[PDB]
Amino acid sequence: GETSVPPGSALVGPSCVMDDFRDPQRWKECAKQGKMPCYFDLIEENVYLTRMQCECTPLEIACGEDCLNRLLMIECSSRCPNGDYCSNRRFQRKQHADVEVILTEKKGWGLRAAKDLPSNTFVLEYCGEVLDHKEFKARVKEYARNKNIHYYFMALKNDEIIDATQKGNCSRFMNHSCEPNCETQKWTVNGQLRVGFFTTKLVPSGSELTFDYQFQRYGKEAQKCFCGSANCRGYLGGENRVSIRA
Ligand SMILES: CC(C)C[NH2+][C@@H](CC[C@@H]([NH3+])C(=O)O)C[C@H]1O[C@@H](n2cnc3c(N)ncnc32)[C@H](O)[C@@H]1O
Ligand SMILES: [Zn+2]
Ligand SMILES: [Zn+2]
Ligand SMILES: [Zn+2]
């Protein structure tokens, strides 16, 4: 039939907002109604189970692209020459991009840009429980036995795996794309390695934020990939990195 501009529609039961992730009672209400994802423990920094001073002239960006710390993926300290105005303390100040959580047709929940994000914009820290090999192997078996639909593991370093299944932040919702618009970067903050999502191109407002989910991509089992990209590899998992054998 003939289509028309719809009338203005207001909700009656108030809509769920991003600040409701810091409000457990409202979140659990919204989740029952399917207006928010299943509850998890929102954490501000990683939970463990088991010097560097730039030459930036005090200030049009304070500790911009030429900052000797930034160049090595090291954050500045409170002693930075630019003091409070240092732009290279993003993890410490939790200077996350403007993001919104969305419900996708096929992949579950996801993350979208709420503003245009330039290339190499800090999106969010990937926070979770930091697991040793033993705990990781146990939880892999635990999650497999429970038939978990989604995975939230990310390697931090060769002996440490972040698990955001139970505890983390909204970065846990990031979905895989075969042609992604974000990457992870591992930054040193007060001597401790932390991992965050960063855009790899200009991401326009309203676009889903996506990454190459390496943990699953190179794992043994596979699943249908719903990324929709022009050169989608068809499935996620069961792949090996390039090698030249024999
Ligand atoms: C390490 C973190 C960032 C990993 N974050 C989850 C998001 C779950 C979130 N959607 C939800 O609802 O809580 C990955 C899982 O999401 C699914 N997922 C993603 N991208 C898919 C694709 N392109 N095709 C199919 N499933 C795809 C898959 O199960 C993956 O393990
Ligand atoms: Zn600097
Ligand atoms: Zn600085
Ligand atoms: Zn794909």
Could you tell me the sign of the dihedral formed by the alpha carbons of 218, 223, 225, 231, in that order?
positive
Q: Which atom of ligand 1 is nearest to the CA of 211?
A: 3
- Domains in the chain, number: 1
Ligand 1 neighbour 87 (Cβ under 6 A): no
CA–centroid distance, 147 to ligand 1, in Å, is 14
Q: Which of 213, 220, 224, 235 to mutate to test the pocket of ligand 1 (most atoms within 8 A of CB)?
A: 213
Domain enclosing residue 45, as ranges? 1-246
CA–centroid distance, 43 to ligand 2, in Å, is 29
Ligand 1 neighbour 109 (Cβ under 6 A): yes
Ligand nearest to the CA of 67: 2
Coil, helix or strand at residue 31: helix
94 to 43, 116, 120, 239: CA distances (angstroms)? 12, 19, 16, 34
Instruction: Give the CA count within 13 Å in the CB-facing half-sphere of 73.
Output: 13
The answer to whether 208 touches 242, Cβ cutoff 8 Å, is: no
| Nearest-angstrom CA–CA distance, 196 and 177 | 17
Backbone angles phi, psi at 15, to 5 degrees: -75, 155
CA–centroid distance, 194 to ligand 2, in Å, is 19
Q: Which of 107, 123, 229 to mutate to test the pocket of ligand 1 (most atoms within 8 A of CB)?
A: 107
| Nearest-angstrom CA–CA distance, 197 and 127 | 11
The answer to whether 124 touches 97, Cβ cutoff 8 Å, is: yes
Q: Which atom of ligand 1 is nearest to the CA of 108?
A: 12
| Nearest-angstrom CA–CA distance, 210 and 183 | 8
With vertex at residue 70, the alpha carbon angle to CA 117 and CA 121, rounded to the nearest 5 degrees, is: 5
Ligand 1 neighbour 172 (Cβ under 6 A): yes
Ligand nearest to the CA of 108: 1
